[model samples]
Target: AQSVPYGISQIKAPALHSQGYTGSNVKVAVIDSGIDSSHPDLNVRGGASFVPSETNPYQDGSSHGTHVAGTIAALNNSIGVLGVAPSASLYAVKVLDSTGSGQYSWIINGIEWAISNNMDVINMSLGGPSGSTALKTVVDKAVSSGIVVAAAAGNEGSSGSSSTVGYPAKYPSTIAVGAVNSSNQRASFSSAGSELDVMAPGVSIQSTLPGGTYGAYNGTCMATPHVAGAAALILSKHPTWTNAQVRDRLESTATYLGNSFYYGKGLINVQAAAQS
Candidate 1:
């Protein structure tokens, strides 16, 4: 029962998993803090680091990247919770340091690495408020090169209506993800913007952390991976599809939620996306 985490169930990932669309042979680069490679629930295939000091991609210091990676492809074994694309090949492209800080160059280099490595998908659960032409260019490059890029819309929501989507996610090429609760209500802190692509379970999300532990956290950081994992599932089912094709499928198939600024196309429906 624990095998299907609420976020995975919310997006209906098991429907595809049951149909042998478990993202096998797909390569997803988690471009964030890093991953705990030694964690039993996670199987990191390989990785690289953009941070100056932290040379090891498997050594997660902030635990942010590890949690995001778990939501995308944690092992399907009996003990812990399962992921959306349980069999996907996860590569840690560590751009953030232990303090959960990253430079624009680091993120750009990470995207460049994913492109060079032929990554099928790139999940970026980090973001910044200001726009950067340099960052946008790299994101576009990755998308043009056939990598489905997903990034957090940001956690800067307000009761007032205004644009809050952040950099790389603000770019048209990347899938900008917002946060919603289990009840499908937009989380108070989830950013809203016209560029936002989809919403997913981000409130109190439980996933793997460093040192073989599990914890619940909140943010668009959690929601972004749900979409990234869904993209992997779709790619596994239809390997020849282009990044834009996969993105269109996910957007067109989402369950309708109100407000384009908040929910974009709506909550991501992984099963619907894969089948269509």
Candidate 2:
């Protein structure tokens, strides 16, 4: 067996992978800056760039999206890190600019494009304070079209103060994911709120990076892809399961921590989710 990274190991993705649920044929849209298609560990089936400035959908000069992509579908090729859903069809829906900044409209366009092309799941590891009805409309539409939306709960947490979760993740249609450290405790920087559905390994999470290398990143952004990839694994197992069913399976099978804020239903357990 391949030596799994802590995040995937903690989620028991290796167990599901041993059962042959490798997210095969599952279309996962990653709406972010972009992905470095040249990354040896990545198998990008297809992609598109909503940002006109970025003509190549796979050109990830910012490195954020590529990192996020690796966390979702980097092939378990025995060199670089592995994603939870290694065999998934990874699509780079580039909505953010090279500076890793994008407007709400760009995100909305990404969502629309993903649904138009029939994506099974969308991982949005980005968010802002302001919520847009138009963006929410498209997110809801993606759900209606059977697309599972997973998103970051934001890195706005404080030990002695409360922080609000940003948009997209705040929407009812999206699965809001927070972060936990290797010890399975809530990451100090991960945001919390009533909207959070579950937590995942995020603190110092090892994953693939741009320029044919690997590194660690921490955020709810890093956390969201775990659940997204877990969803991919479950979807690969139960190809006919609805998005709601997928979401519920993830939530109900989670390692329950306390509170909807810090833990949601708790950390995700991929094997339990994919098991009968």
Candidate 3:
């Protein structure tokens, strides 16, 4: 028989799904390049664009946001691969443009909308080396408002290279996610910082792309969604959970790897996180 994807196995999402936790009724905001609305798997909730005058947030010419959305909530149908939170609805907040980059204002606007609407969780796969006080303020507010925020730790890795985790992830309230390969080894490109919150499968991750296709992509961009999806699953089981409670449970239950930098609490394990 066919099995769940290795990335899903790495996080043990199937166990939660087996227990009827498909992130049902959970709302996750995918603040990225936008999603392919016409895709078969994704049942997108309405979306908005922060890019000036760009109307359609569902036309994903870049494929990055769509891929991130899929990992969080691709439908658990018979055909394609299922996501960690398969029953959740993906809200596409288009902060990044076709070039896969967006201004801080655009990002700030997206965060405002996501939290104001009471989105259960927000997955920001994009990151920058610089921290924005303006952006950090909104992220802190999101946490204050009970929205769980997750972001990529960054791909800037240096055996000798020293760069703090990228912004948003670098923020204390945001869950900073690092990358690990199927072998459970830290991907050489995954950034390391004491602020890093957890690790997940990131190397060559297979998920939805544009034109109803699937492709493999790497980076903490790929790994961050695993944690976001895990948060969604946890929320499904405990809808009343506070942001900090949700964050604490995820960290405390992770599969221990090493020091806090490369794997803060270590690789996320949804099976363990969903239960006591």
Of the candidates shown, which would achieve the greatest lDDT relative to the real structure?
Answer: 1
lDDT of each: 0.92, 0.89, 0.88
TM-score of each: 0.98, 0.97, 0.96
Clashing pairs in 1: none
| Tens digit of per-residue lDDT, candidate 3, span 115-189 | 878898999998898888999999999999989899999998844535568998988889999999998889889
Which residue pairs collide, candidate 3? none
lDDT of 1 by residue, 49-75 (tens): 999999999999999999999999989
Global lDDT of model 2? 0.89
lDDT rank order: 1, 2, 3
Angstrom error of the Cα, residue 42, model 2: value is 0.4
- Give candidates' CA RMSD values in order: 1.1, 1.5, 1.5
